[PDB]
Amino acid sequence: DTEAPQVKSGDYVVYRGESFEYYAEITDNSGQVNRVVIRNVEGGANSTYLSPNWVKYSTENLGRPGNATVQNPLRTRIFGEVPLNEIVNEKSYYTRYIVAWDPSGNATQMVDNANRNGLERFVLTVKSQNEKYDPAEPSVTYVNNLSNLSTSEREAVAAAVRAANPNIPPTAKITVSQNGTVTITYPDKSTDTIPANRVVKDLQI
Ligand SMILES: CO[C@@H]1O[C@H](CO)[C@H](O)[C@H](O[C@]2(C(=O)O)C[C@H](O)[C@@H](NC(C)=O)[C@H]([C@H](O)[C@H](O)CO)O2)[C@H]1O
Ligand SMILES: [Ca+2]
Numbered sequence: 653d654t655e656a657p658q659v660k661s662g663d664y665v666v667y668r669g670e671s672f673e674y675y676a677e678i679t680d681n682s683g684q685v686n687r688v689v690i691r692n693v694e695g696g697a698n699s700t701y702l703s704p705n706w707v708k709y710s711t712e713n714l715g716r717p718g719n720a721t722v723q724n725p726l727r728t729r730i731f732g733e734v735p736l737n738e739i740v741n742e743k744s745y746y747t748r749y750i751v752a753w754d755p756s757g758n759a760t761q762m763v764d765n766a767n768r769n770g771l772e773r774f775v776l777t778v779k780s781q782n783e784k785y786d787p788a789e790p791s792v793t794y795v796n797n798l799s800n801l802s803t804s805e806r807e808a809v810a811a812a813v814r815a816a817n818p819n820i821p822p823t824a825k826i827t828v829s830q831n832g833t834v835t836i837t838y839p840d841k842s843t844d845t846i847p848a849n850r851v852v853k854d855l856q857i
């Protein structure tokens with residue numbers, strides 16, 4: 653319904669142990685939107701049920717003339733904190749709908765089709781925490797023997813990786829094995845690994 657408010661959302665990827673914040677933009681031909689609900693598909697016209705319960709949202713400047721124009725769309729904040737105990741797999745996404753109402757009571761229609769994703773329909777994808785980070789591997793630590801790093805050398809590699817990766821969670825644990833393999837264990841206990849060849853060299857040859 654192009655006489656109902658129109659919504660532009662996005663690909664709302666979120667990560668265990670991390671806060672998220674996205675904005676959707678809403679316009680209406682009347683220039684005004686009075687109400688915005690984000691909801692699961694189930695329930696019928698009056699439902700506001702939305703899960704997971706940690707998905708929050710808010711819309712400032714509701715119910716004012718000109719609050720929802722093409723040149724200055726209404727914005728809805730979609731935010732929350734993803735718990736560490738969320739299940740993560742290829743199916744750990746949640747398809748949700750943004751419904752907005754204009755002064756005539758026309759509400760954005762919910763159409764159950766993936767071609768509407770990024771409009772009034774959006775997918776909230778929950779990923780493990782390691783997926784938020786792409787550890788930098790540009791550091792180089794020279795060790796005596798690549799097949800047998802000492803404790804000091806293992807700590808040196810971990811410190812080099814940390815120094816190259818100020819953005820990874822401070823409480824993520826960087827450990828290095830006896831052959832220089834790096835494991836980054838995130839707060840949600842997911843891991844990234846860095847092969848030794850990318851962080852360690854020796855002068856044995
Ligand atoms: C009516 O059936 C639902 O229709 C919606 C679209 O309107 C979805 O297709 C939904 O399926 C999913 C989804 O929300 O995309 C498929 C996901 O794999 C499920 N996630 C998990 C972690 O199992 C969700 C989830 O079960 C649901 O969103 C709970 O509110 O459902 C259809 O079930
Ligand atoms: Ca309208």
Ligand code: NA
Nearest residue numbers: 782783785844
């Ligand atoms: Na990663």
